[PDB]
């Protein structure tokens, strides 16, 4: 018939609606990082015919 309840909040339903924490990972060292970035930059639009 189109009859609707009040909007019950998930806190009132005692439901634990929280997102997972961002899963950490140990990165490659900073020197390796910028060498990879320089390798990728040599394959992309502003470099000559790339």
């Amino acid at each position: 018939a189109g009859n609707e309840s009040e909007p019950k909040t998930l806190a009132e339903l005692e439901a634990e609606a929280a997102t997972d924490e961002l899963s950490p990972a140990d990165p490659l060292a900073p020197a390796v990082r910028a060498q990879i970035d320089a390798l990728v930059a040599a394959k992309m639009k502003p470099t000559s015919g790339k």
């Binding site: 900073p30 020197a31 990082r33 910028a34 060498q35 970035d37 320089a38 930059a41 040599a42 502003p46 470099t47």
Partner: protein
């Protein structure tokens, strides 16, 4: 002000800021040399020498304006490639390690002077002991100019001297000598002359008696020089 690899107590700089109010910079870069390879040790049979390492590439003294730079930069300087060790017995040698690549980048710009490649292991095989390729230059965001490093020399069944380079890039190392099966030893080649600040490739080392031989030469360290206005 200017910073160079020549400055005592210099360190590797990752994401340091471009200096406050500085109008731009002039950059100069050289790659590191590759380490040489080592030859077979034995009492008997053919004993070929390991290859020489390649020299580093070089990018010449070129300007960038602060409008083309980003807020931060990198200035990685190549470390010299380690030379191939002894056979540790009556067996084949070792490869070198490649030289570290030298890298500048900031914002839209990257400038890279690659390290020279390792000299290959010597074996019982006449085709063994190949010399390393010289380091190539990569450029982006500014119309800079640079030069490729010199070839490292083959050892193997025809030992050779490394390619000399005055043209801002680094020279290659020479290849190792050796010994035949039924006859006495045969000579290696020399390292090339150079004047580029990029690192020279290390010499290979000789195929030799089961007690003899040496470690191959290291490549030289690369170079960074940047002037801020």
């Amino acid at each position: 002000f200017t910073i160079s690899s020549e400055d005592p107590g210099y360190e590797d700089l990752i994401d340091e800021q471009v200096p406050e109010g500085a109008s731009g910079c002039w950059v100069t870069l050289g790659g590191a040399g590759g380490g040489g390879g080592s030859g077979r040790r034995a009492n008997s049979g053919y004993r070929y020498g390991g290859g020489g390492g390649g020299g580093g590439g070089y990018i010449d003294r070129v300007w960038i304006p602060r409008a083309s730079l980003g807020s931060t930069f990198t200035l990685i300087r190549g470390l010299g490639g380690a030379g191939g060790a002894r056979a540790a017995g009556s067996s084949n040698g070792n490869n070198g390690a490649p030289g570290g690549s030298t890298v500048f980048s900031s914002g839209s710009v990257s400038l890279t002077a690659s390290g020279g490649a390792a000299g290959v292991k010597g074996t019982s095989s006449s085709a063994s002991g190949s010399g390393g390729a010289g380091g190539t230059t990569s450029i982006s965001g500014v119309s800079a100019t640079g030069y490729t490093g010199g070839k490292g020399g083959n050892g193997g069944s025809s030992p050779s001297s490394g390619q000399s380079r005055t043209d801002g890039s680094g020279a290659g190392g020479g290849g190792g000598g050796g010994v035949r099966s039924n006859d006495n030893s045969f000579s290696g080649g020399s390292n090339g002359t150079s004047s580029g600040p990029a690192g020279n490739g290390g010499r290979g080392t000789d195929g030799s008696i089961n007690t003899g031989g040496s470690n191959a030469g290291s490549g030289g360290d690369g170079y960074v020089l940047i002037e801020w206005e």
